Design a protein around this ligand. Structure first.
Ligand SMILES: [Ca+2]
Ligand SMILES: [Zn+2]
Lengths: 606, 145, 48
C-alpha cells in the first residue's frame, strides 16, 4: 500500500492504525472491507452528489475549484454510481436531479436481451411513433425493460422443482446460443443432404460410410435443440409479452373502462380475449399491481353497481374482503394435502396459451419444431430450416418485409395482370386460334388455344414469362390475311403485360426494399445526429469538443432515465425529495410533462 | 507480377488493360460502386441461392419428368435425376433464361400436373427473375448513383 | 499577414501536392463532418 503509488506515508500509517492484531499478527481484509467500506461508500456518494450539484450549478470559483479537485478525486470512484436527469416541472425551468445507480441495474442493462429490446424500441418508436406518443412509448418501454431486468436477475417437492427451475433458467439463459447451434446443425444437415444421389430408391451414394448414421444423429440432435429453443423461449420472452398484455388490459380497465363503459367492438379479437380473463383469479400475475381490481371497483362501483362490478371482475361475495383483511386477518395457510395439482386456474392458463400462440415468434419456433418433426419423417424437410438465416440477418429480414410491405398494391397489380392476360386470352381464343400449334413434326396438332381454360393458362404461363411477349414462341403469320391484326395484338401484349405491368410489380417490390432500407438509415442518422428526449439538434451542441456526445451520454441518457424510474419505483416513498416526489406524482397520474420537450440545461442557463 | 506472368504466357498482358479503370474517374466510380454495397450484395445473392435451392428441391421431388434436355436422344439427358445436378441446372439456366425456367424445358400439356407446374414456374419467374435479380441490379445501380 | 516563399509556391504547384489536396478535399467532405474537419485539415497541412 506504500509502493502502489496511491498512498502517502501518512495515509499508510493512518490505515495501519485501523488494524485488529488478533494475537498472531494477521488482519482479515475480508471483514475489514465488509465492515469499513459500505457506510463510507454511502456517505461518500451523498457528499459526491452534493459536490457535483454545486459544481454543475456554480462554476468558476477558485475556492470551489480546490473543493472540486478534491471532489473529483472522490468522484473517480462514484462516476458509474451517480446518474443525472433533466426534469422540467414545478418550476417552469430545467432542473438537474441526481440519483443512485445500482451495479445490479447496470449488469441487467448490459444483459443481451435488454439491448435487443432497446434497439427494437428505438426502431419502432422512430419509424411509426411520432412525437405525441413518443414519451408514452418511452415510459412503457422503461417499464417493460425494468420488468425484463428483474426477470434476468431472477434467471419430494423440494427435489424435482428446484432442479426443473434450474433447467428452465439455464435454457432461458442460453436461448440465443441454442439458436446459433440449431442454425449450425441445420447447415450441416443440409450439406449432408446435398451430398446425395438416387438409384424410386433414395440412397446417399456420393460418400463411402461415415455419412449415413451421422445424418440421423444430426436430425435427432436438431430436433432436441429445437425443443430446447422453444422451451427456453417460453421461459425467457413469454413473461415479457404476457406482462405487456396484462399491463395494457389493466390500464384499459382502470383508466378507460374498456369492459365497464366502452365495451370493445366485434372484430377486435384482442378485446374479447382480454375480456376472457378480466375476471380471473390471478389477473395481474406479472404487472406487480395486485390492486387494479380494487382500484377499478372503487372507481366504477358507485355508478354501475358494486355487485355488478364484483361479479364481472371476479372475486365474488368478497366486497368486504378488504375490511376483513384490515381487521383481524389470517396469518397464513398451508397449501394442501389432497390437492397437489389443479391448483392453477385453467382459465388463466388457457389465456396464456392463447396469447403465446399469437406472438408471431412463438409461432415461428412452433413452425420450426414441426418442420424438424416432419424432417424426421422425410429428411428433405430439413431444407426449410435454411430460411432461418433470413430471419437472423438484418437485410434479409428487410427483403422479406419488403416483399410483404406493399401487400395490397402487389395483390391488386397481380389481379390487373391476370385480367389483361384474360382479355388477351379471349381475343386470341376468338380470332387468333389457328396460330397456337405447339409442335415440330406432329402429325397430331397440339393446339393450346382450342379450349378457353387451356388457352388462358397457356397465356398466363408462356406469354408473361417469355420476356418478349407471346408471339416470339408461336408461329409467325407471314400472310396478308391477319398479319396486321396479329402483330398489333402481339405488340400491345408485349407492351402492357411485359414492359409495363410486370415492370410495375418489379418496381413495387424494389421500391419497398429501398424504402425499408432508407427508413433504417434515417433512423440510424436520427439517433446519431439528434437527441431522443429533447431533440434540440446537433449543431447546437457542436460548439465544444465532444459536445453532443457528452450531452447524449451524460445529460439525456435513456439508460439514466430508466435507472431514475427504477430508483423512484424502489425508493420507498415518504423518503422522496421534492423533485422525486413531483416526478413520481406525474408518473402516477400519467402526464409525462416532466420530460424536457423543447429545452435543456444548456439552453436554459449559461 | 502480372507482367512477369505475361513474360511466361503473353496473354497475361490483358490484365494490364484494367489500368484505365483505375486511371479514369467514373470507372473508379463503377468499381467502387460494385464494391460499396458489399454485404447487401452478398446477402441478396445468398437469398437468391436459397430460393433457387427451394425451387430445386420441389422440382426434384415433383417435377422431375420434365427435365429432359434432348431433341432426338434416344438416351434421355435427365438433368433433374440428381440433387446436385438439378440444383446446378436450376442456378445455371433458370436464373439466366430471362423468363424463368419453364421456357426451356418441356411444356406439360396434360391435365395431371398442369396447374401445379404452371404455378411453380410463374412463382419462380416472379421471385427469382423479376424480384431478386432486379434487387441486386438495383443495388448496384443505386450504389453507382 | 505573413510572407510566402517562391519555393513554397512552386512545391504547392507540384502535381502530387495537387493530387493529395483533391484527395483530402474529397475524403473530408464525404466522410468527415465538422467536429473533426479542422483536425483533418491540420493533419493534411502537415502531410502536405
Ligand atoms: Ca419525506
Ligand atoms: Zn437532449
Amino acid at each position: 500500500m506504500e509502493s502502489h503509488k496511491h498512498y502517502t506515508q501518512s495515509e499508510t500509517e493512518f490505515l495501519l492504525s485501523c488494524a485488529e492484531t488478533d494475537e498472531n499478527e494477521t488482519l482479515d481484509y475480508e471483514e475489514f472491507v465488509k465492515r469499513f467500506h459500505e457506510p463510507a461508500k454511502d456517505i461518500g456518494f451523498n457528499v459526491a452528489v452534493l459536490l457535483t450539484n454545486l459544481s454543475e450549478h456554480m462554476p468558476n470559483d477558485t475556492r470551489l475549484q480546490t473543493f472540486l479537485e478534491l471532489a473529483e478525486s472522490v468522484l473517480n470512484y462514484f462516476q458509474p454510481f451517480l446518474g443525472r436527469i433533466e426534469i422540467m416541472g414545478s418550476a417552469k425551468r430545467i432542473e438537474r436531479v441526481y440519483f443512485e445507480i445500482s451495479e445490479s441495474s447496470r449488469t441487467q442493462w448490459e444483459k443481451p436481451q435488454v439491448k435487443e429490446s432497446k434497439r427494437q424500441f428505438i426502431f419502432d418508436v422512430v419509424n411509426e411513433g411520432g412525437e405525441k406518443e413518443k414519451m408514452e412509448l418511452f415510459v412503457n418501454f422503461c417499464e417493460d425493460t425494468i420488468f425484463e431486468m428483474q426477470l434476468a436477475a431472477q434467471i419430494f417437492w423440494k427435489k424435482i422443482i428446484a432442479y426443473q427451475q434450474k433447467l428452465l433458467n439455464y435454457f432461458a439463459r442460453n436461448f440465443y446460443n441454442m439458436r446459433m447451434l440449431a442454425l449450425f446443425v441445420a447447415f450441416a444437415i443440409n450439406f449432408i443432404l446435398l451430398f446425395y444421389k438416387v438409384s424410386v430408391h433414395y440412397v446417399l451414394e456420393e460418400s463411402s460410410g461415415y455419412m449415413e448414421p451421422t445424418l440421423r444423429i444430426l436430425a435427432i440432435l436438431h430436433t432436441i435443440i429445437s425443443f430446447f429453443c422453444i422451451i427456453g423461449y417460453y421461459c425467457l420472452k413469454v413473461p415479457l409479452v404476457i406482462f405487456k398484455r396484462e399491463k395494457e388490459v389493466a390500464r384499459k380497465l382502470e383508466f378507460d373502462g374498456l369492459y365497464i363503459t366502452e365495451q370493445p367492438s366485434e372484430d377486435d379479437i384482442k378485446g374479447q380475449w382480454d375480456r376472457l380473463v378480466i375476471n380471473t383469479q390471478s389477473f395481474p400475475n406479472n404487472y406487480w399491481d395486485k390492486f387494479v381490481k380494487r382500484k377499478v371497483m372503487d372507481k366504477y362501483g358507485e355508478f354501475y353497481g358494486r355487485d355488478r362490478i364484483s361479479e364481472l371482475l371476479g372475486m365474488d361475495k368478497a366486497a368486504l374482503d378488504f375490511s376483513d383483511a384490515r381487521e383481524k386477518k389470517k396469518p397464513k395457510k398451508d397449501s394442501s394435502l389432497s390437492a397437489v395439482l389443479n391448483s392453477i386456474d385453467v382459465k388463466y392458463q388457457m389465456w396464456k396459451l392463447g396469447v403465446v400462440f399469437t406472438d408471431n415468434s412463438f409461432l415461428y419456433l412452433a413452425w420450426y419444431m414441426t418442420m424438424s418433426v416432419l424432417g424426421h419423417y422425410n429428411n428433405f424437410f430439413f431444407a426449410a430450416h435454411l430460411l432461418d438465416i433470413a430471419m437472423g440477418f438484418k437485410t434479409l429480414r428487410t427483403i422479406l418485409s419488403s416483399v410483404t410491405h406493399n401487400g395490397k398494391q402487389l395483390v391488386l397489380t397481380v389481379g390487373l395482370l391476370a385480367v389483361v392476360v384474360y382479355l388477351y386470352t379471349v381475343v386470341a381464343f376468338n380470332f387468333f386460334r389457328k396460330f397456337y400449334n405447339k409442335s415440330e413434326d406432329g402429325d397430331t396438332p397440339d393446339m393450346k388455344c382450342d379450349d378457353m381454360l387451356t388457352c388462358y393458362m397457356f397465356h398466363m404461363y408462356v406469354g408473361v414469362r417469355a420476356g418478349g411477349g407471346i408471339g416470339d414462341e408461336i408461329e409467325d403469320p407471314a400472310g396478308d390475311e391477319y398479319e396486321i391484326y396479329r402483330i398489333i395484338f402481339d405488340i400491345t401484349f408485349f407492351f402492357f403485360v411485359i414492359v409495363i405491368l410486370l415492370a410495375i410489380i418489379q418496381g413495387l417490390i424494389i421500391d419497398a426494399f429501398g424504402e425499408l432500407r432508407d427508413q433504417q438509415e434515417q433512423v440510424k442518422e436520427d439517433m446519431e445526429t439528434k437527441c431522443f428526449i429533447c431533440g434540440i439538434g446537433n449543431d447546437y451542441f457542436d460548439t465544444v469538443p465532444h459536445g453532443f456526445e457528452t450531452h447524449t451520454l451524460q445529460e439525456h441518457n435513456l439508460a439514466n432515465y430508466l435507472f431514475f424510474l427504477m430508483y423512484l419505483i424502489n425508493k420507498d416513498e415518504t423518503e422522496h425529495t421534492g423533485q422525486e416526489s413531483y416526478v413520481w406524482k406525474m408518473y402516477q397520474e400519467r402526464c409525462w410533462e416532466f420530460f424536457p420537450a423543447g429545452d435543456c440545461f444548456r439552453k436554459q442557463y449559461e
